[model samples]
Target: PTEVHASDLTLDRFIDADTLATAVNLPGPSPELRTVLLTGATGFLGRYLVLELLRRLDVDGRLICLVRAESDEDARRRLEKTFDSGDPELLRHFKELAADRLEVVAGDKSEPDLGLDQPMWRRLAETVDLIVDSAAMVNAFPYHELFGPNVAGTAELIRIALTTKLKPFTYVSTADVGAAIEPSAFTEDADIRVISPTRTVDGGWAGGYGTSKWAGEVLLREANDLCALPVAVFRCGMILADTSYAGQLNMSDWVTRMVLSLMATGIAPRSFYEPDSEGNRQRAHFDGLPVTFVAEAIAVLGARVAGSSLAGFATYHVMNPHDDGIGLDEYVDWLIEAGYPIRRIDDFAEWLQRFEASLGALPDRQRRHSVLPMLLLQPLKPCSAPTDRFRAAVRAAKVGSDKDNPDIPHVSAPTIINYVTNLQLLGLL
Candidate 1:
């Protein structure tokens, strides 16, 4: 019976309302939040951002969802199903805000010019006051599968935003764009010329997704420069949330799951993709990566642009700068403190040491081996040993408890207790 929470109510309120309000200005006078066009409304990030937007707005000004679907119902069903899966009993939480208010504008990111016809594009140009671009293919490796979705779609969205009469535009970019640059403290105004990715104009990119995402950034910049429009770009880091806090849980991607598992373990030592000389992801708790916090950052940035006298595009980096966050490690410790078995890692300390060390030891190896022998007969095998292990882990780890509860933590720092408990809620464990 556990339900996923919204991020706005969870994390930002924890920091201070004015702080969030100052960053993302709320719409006023009309009482209704402005008509907002939300791309990627089905994405994990998009879903949470949309929910935040919904919470802030009245029923008058609607949320226009640009989704790829046959009808409005299909798109709404897809979105609602995801939320239902996240929290079953509370599926009707937003009963009043049906598709009529939360309209689905059918379109595909892969389509040419966003599949916008002359009339629809013009209508959107005049109607919407705000836009949140959250749609993107999260491929670390680009070119083949990513180019159409990430770069082209973003470029087209920019074109559409440029044609819009009023309303500020906001983009949810990643802090990883800094990966293309040499290691350094990446400030909001850090020179992207040195950091933004570039390939040989002919198509060879050293940094795959980073390269394409960088291209998307340049597109937004160019649009702003040409039109001198009110644009706010957020280079965000990983977003985290659950149901109970002021924020909602976003259960997709390995990073979120990993943080939850680490918290459940009670301590997250040093596991990281970009390991340092010591080979650790580093650990600490600072600004927790609550989905609401990320949404608030966007809201704040949007608010600043809408309220400011500034004419051109502005940029901000929304992230927990610490390689590791505080309470993060402690949360992992708490997981062990709770009853969830730590069968994968010898102890919390070992997995915290490095993911590889932890990966070398997992319970699924046996099950994976049991299934792998039959794969030799297939023409192509989609799942491998590691894949099977991961699947098994999700299946076993994400299951909800036999019992049910409506109150769950809203926003969470990586904590073992939250992760294990949510796994039961999600039916993952």
Candidate 2:
């Protein structure tokens, strides 16, 4: 299949003029934050961000969440469901914290003003100090299907960032945004226009999810120039399970599905990668990090004071950023070492046939959560990403709670072992 269509890749077609107009001679964000607005507060990564914000905030500082719900109470309930769904002990402080610190507002990111009324929107622009957006729909839908929540919602956030007093904008973008574009042009410091002037409507490795994020980045880049609003973009790779908590897997994520299916079928491929010239598995790596690390990196790096244009504009590739010869192959090895009854099949073709048959035998829920669908559509292969900037930032800012530990940890045996442990606890294994 062809990778890109030059016709549909124009960045201008995706830029929102209204967002530029909203940038009219506004002040930049405050060096110090008092009140913050966060999107995707009810999600897996968002939940941890809430806990981190609460921990880092001042005694009286506020953390407001824009949740998609019919009512504010319903939105609070949704947030509660996610925070409690995992290990409450990880965020047990959530219950003890001042309920006044966290506020939930009913709104829809797909809407123009986040579905908020005039009075509420104005109030938010006036009082909110900064904006952290972690909301997105990760699906196999077309670009049009995801544009509303991922792309247009980003435009709306930029509009808000430029409204009233300028507020810094922190976006949780994906690392796969430039899958088909030239990587040299798609770097952290480079302008998005130069990176991908024309993008395929739905041809990138991440498909619509990738295209949607690309549009979001383009809009933010334009805003950084037009409005000079402080902007921080973290293009994250796969966000793995929570390191501290047990049974806290992102069940919807591909990594989790692969882990679960491999265990359930009790069979594995010789290698989930393209073979070398000798028809043997080649050295490859998997890119991922604990969810806690990802959130902390975003929060600390994004919370910087943007007193100057040069100080404000920054981008970081939040990923494991390691090359110690690790991949999905290592994950299965860990599981096998953990004393599972898995059998490694040397023949790739034979493994596929048996893998599908095994998945078919699983219960409906397990089959639905398996990687059979994605493997059939696209071959499963190991992937890695550069984190030169991310590592330096983590070291400089001391991203995690511990100020001494500047190193970004790798997602290796212990992490995947936890994934298996969590899956078993979730009853998915």
Candidate 3:
């Protein structure tokens, strides 16, 4: 059998007693921040989170990014490149603040001491008032390939968080951490360890990714108990396009690829759902949130936890669990109504066959962006995640609503239609 299993993900196995001893009796970061350290600043959500932090900080507050580069200048350049949007105003803003509030450091998470020298690491521990870790290696590769950067790297960062000053840490995690447990119903505040003290590994690449993230979560939870560290873990789902930004879309993700492939193929299956034996509507929903909304919620909510008097570890789910009868099927219908050149086939098998063929026949530009290679892999009907805790926190901060979206908004047909808009802008259409 090609199956594999791993259960030796204990906190003691990774973080030795010496490291844990440094954090004992230490307090968390100051409720009022001076400088906040941010990782993964050059990534997709990282850029928006940077913008949000820029707006959230006081006049003198600083945002320090830990980047992997040969030099400080190179690290700063990498940070600038994340704002490489067609919209020039954002770049201008980044440059204007780049010299003042934004500071860059060359560092790698996978390396010992987070690629910083002994003195630099100690200085950062003392100076940085807070930490937001978004740095991760996300791919379909197996866990071993991802363990270095995602798991071990997280362990290394936790070491620094426990040193000198106790910085409040906010970790950006994936909803895929569901690999650790079998329960379909769990709350945001549930004890993850109690749900599954020893997480399992099923050997699939997706499962591997989830397991690695789960390992990071476990370490952080353990670290919290040892130091009373202020921690907030937000496990996010499909973070959709930046609705407020022009030509901004997460093109590499499955959702965008599916939409592009279907549009390029000019065809779709009659339904993206399988009816039960009863032959009635199964009533499935999609899990996605606008990137802007997600980033803002994280920045605000995470900062609040750091600013709280209690400074406890908070676990939140950042997902759209709405069962509002709006999903992949309705998205296609909206595209058709809006005059996109796609139609539905009554038979799923026939539709899939044609879909694969069309993908093969597309121009190189479109062919490379299609997801036809996984036609047999069934899409999971994602379970409904409880978000009462996250929503209550958002309400307390008065940020779950915007002018167009009131609260963690449902996936709007108008929003998904932009999949067509940005895909064409990227030349896939």
- Which candidate ranks first by lDDT, i.e. highest? 2
TM-score of 1: 0.66
CA lDDT, every model vs. true structure: 0.51, 0.75, 0.74
Give the residue spans of candidate 3 off by over 4 A: 1-18, 97-99, 135-145, 200-202, 276-282, 306-311, 373-383, 403-406
Error (Å) of candidate 3 at residue 127 is 0.9
The local distance difference test score of model 2 is 0.75
Q: Point out the higher-scoring one by TM-score: 1 or 2.
A: 2
In every candidate, how many clashes are there? 60, 2, 0
TM-score of each: 0.66, 0.89, 0.89
- By summed lDDT, which 10 consecutive residues of candidate 1 come out lowest? 377-386
Model 2 residue 411 lDDT score: 64
lDDT (0-100) at residue 296 of candidate 1? 52
lDDT of 1 by residue, 126-158 (tens): 677777888432323221235435666775565
lDDT of 2 by residue, 1-429 (tens): 344433343333444566456665766667888888999886668877888887778888999899888899898887776656457675566765536788888998768789998898888888888799884323332212354356668877776777778888888888777686665666677666666776665454347766777777777777776767788889988888856766565666778888888888999987888876686776777887788999888888888765334646778888776776788888888889989879999888888888989988899888877876665532455523556778888988887656897788776678888877787777777
Which residue runs of candidate 1 sit more than 4 Å off their true CA positions?
1-33, 86-90, 98-100, 136-145, 164-166, 183-185, 194-207, 245-252, 257-288, 309-311, 322-331, 343-416
